Design a protein around this nucleic acid. Structure first.
Ligand SMILES: [Mg+2]
Ligand SMILES: [Mg+2]
Lengths: 96, 134, 134, 48
DNA sequence: AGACAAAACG
RNA sequence: GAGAAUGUCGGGGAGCCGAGGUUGUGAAUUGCUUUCAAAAAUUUUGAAAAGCAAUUCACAAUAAGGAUUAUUCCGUUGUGAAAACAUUCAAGGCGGGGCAACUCGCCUU
DNA sequence: CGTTTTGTCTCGGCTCCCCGACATTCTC
C-alpha cells in the first residue's frame, strides 16, 4: 500500500522521468549553515542544500551565498566540527 | 524570451552623431528597453567626463534620464568577483570586460551587445555576444 | 558608535611600501574592519592594473581575500545618482568623489577616510571626512 | 506614507523608492487621477 | 545498531 | 634482531556476473472520493471525466551529470589550493597460447 | 517556536593480488 508523507523532498534530476523521483538529503550532507545579519543587527539563518553548494562550487563561487533574498550580508557559515565562541550575556563582542 | 544587455559602446554610439548610421542603430537598440550593468553606467560617466568634458550636472541629469525611462540598471551581484576569477582561467579579456560579462551572466542576461569583445563568442555556455552594427 | 568607510587611497597606501609610516597607518585602519564602497573596489582594481600592471589573476585573488577577511563591501544603493545630483549643486568635487560620498552616506557611513577631499569638510551634515595620515 | 515622501523629496531623491526590502525593482508608482491600461486576458503587454 | 534529517507534537 | 622455506588464523584492495525493490510510461480487471449527468424515492440506481490505488504483464531510469562508438568509460576513496594530483604509465629483442583480436613469460638499457 | 519522535535499500556467486599475527627448521 502506498503511504504518503507531507514534507520537503526535491526531485532527483530533470531529464526523462527523473523529475518524477523525490528524495531526501543523505545523512551528514547538511555541511553548510549560513548566518546573515541585516543592517538593523538582526540575525538570519539558513541551511544550504548540497546541490546548491555543488553548483556554486562548480561555478567557482563560494559554497554559501554572501547575501540572502532580503539582502542581509552574510556574517559567516558554519560546518560540523567548527568552533564558535559564545560571549557572556553582558559582553559586547563586535570587534573583540 | 532572451534577456538582452548592453555595453558602454552602444550608448556612446548613441551619444555620438558623427556616424549617423551607427547612432541610429544604437538608438534603435535603446527602443527595446535593454538591460544594462551598473559598471557600464560608471564607465559611461567616466568617458563622458574625460573625452567630451561635459559638465557634471548635465552628465548626471542624462544618466538619471536614461536610467529612469529608457534602460534598466542591473543590481550589482555579490558573486561578481568570484565568478570573474572563475572566468579568467578560461577567458583572456580585459578585467573590465570580464567584470561586465560576469555581472551580465549573473543576472541571467542572454545577449550582450558590444564590438570590442570578439563578437559571436559564447561565455561559459550562457551568453552569446552580438555585434549589432555590422 | 560610528560607521566608518574608506577610499581607494587608504588601500593604495597599504599596498605601497615606499612610505613605511603611511603604509603602517593604512594597515592600522584595516585592522578595524572598516566599511567600503564597491566603487572603491573597482577604482582600486583599475589603478592596480594600470599603474602597477599587476596580473589580473593576482589582483582578483587579492580583491577576494580582502573583501572576504579584512573589509566589508557596501551594497550599491539605487538612490546614488539622484543623491549625487542633489549633492552636486551644493558641492563641487570630482563626480567620482561625489559618487563615493553619495554611496557612503546612503549607507549611513559616519566617517570617510581620504586625503584628496578637503579634509574636515562635512557633507550634508551626515558624514565628516577624516584625514588619518596627518 | 506622505512623511517618507517628504524626506525623499527633500534629499533630492524620487518620491517612491526604486527598490523594496526584498530587492524587487520598482516597476512604477501610481497617483490619483493617473491613467492605466489593463490589457486583455490573452494580451501579453510586455513591450507593447 | 548509530546518529543525522526532518516530520510530528505540543 | 634480520632473512629463506613450510603451515594455521585473520585483515585490505580490485574485478567478472546475478535477483529483487523503488519511481515513472502503457495495458487488463476491480475498487474508494469528487464533479457532471441522467432516471427514480434529502435518499437510491446508471454513463462520462479527474484524483488515489490495488493484482498482473511489457518497458524506462536507478546516485544529478560528463565522455565515447572501444564489444571503453568517469562520477560516495585519500592528500590539499596548484581545483593540481594518487589510485593505468618507457624502449627494444626472444619466446608460449590460441580462429585470430588479445593473454603469459625470458633478455639488455 | 521548542521539543521529541521517526525513518534510514536488500540479498546471491566466484577470482586474484597484497599485508600481518602466530607456530616449525636453519643461517647469520
Ligand atoms: Mg570596456
Ligand atoms: Mg577618487
Amino acid at each position: 500500500v502506498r503511504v504518503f508523507e507531507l514534507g520537503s523532498k526535491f526531485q532527483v534530476g530533470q531529464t526523462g522521468n527523473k523529475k518524477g523521483k523525490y528524495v531526501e538529503a543523505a545523512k551528514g550532507t547538511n555541511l553548510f549553515f549560513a548566518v546573515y545579519e541585516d543592517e538593523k543587527g538582526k540575525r538570519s539563518y539558513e541551511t544550504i542544500p548540497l546541490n546548491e553548494v555543488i553548483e556554486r562550487q562548480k561555478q567557482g563561487l563560494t559554497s554559501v551565498p554572501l547575501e540572502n533574498e532580503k539582502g542581509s550580508r552574510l556574517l559567516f557559515d558554519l560546518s560540523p566540527n567548527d568552533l564558535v565562541y559564545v560571549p557572556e550575556i553582558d559582553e559586547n563582542i563586535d570587534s573583540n | 524570451l532572451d534577456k538582452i544587455a548592453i555595453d558602454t559602446n552602444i550608448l556612446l554610439y548613441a551619444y555620438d552623431n558623427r556616424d549617423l548610421d551607427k547612432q541610429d542603430r544604437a538608438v534603435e537598440i535603446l527602443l527595446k528597453k535593454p538591460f544594462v550593468t551598473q559598471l557600464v553606467v560608471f564607465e559611461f560617466i567616466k568617458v563622458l567626463e574625460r573625452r567630451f568634458k561635459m559638465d557634471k550636472k548635465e552628465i548626471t541629469k542624462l544618466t538619471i534620464k536614461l536610467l529612469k525611462e529608457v534602460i534598466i540598471p542591473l543590481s550589482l551581484h555579490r558573486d561578481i568577483y568570484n565568478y570573474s576569477q572563475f572566468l579568467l582561467q578560461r577567458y583572456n579579456f580585459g578585467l573590465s570586460d570580464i567584470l561586465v560579462l560576469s555581472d551580465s551572466i549573473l543576472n541571467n542576461c542572454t545577449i550582450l551587445l558590444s564590438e570590442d569583445m570578439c563578437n559571436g563568442m559564447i561565455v561559459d555556455k550562457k551568453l552569446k555576444i552580438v555585434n549589432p552594427f555590422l
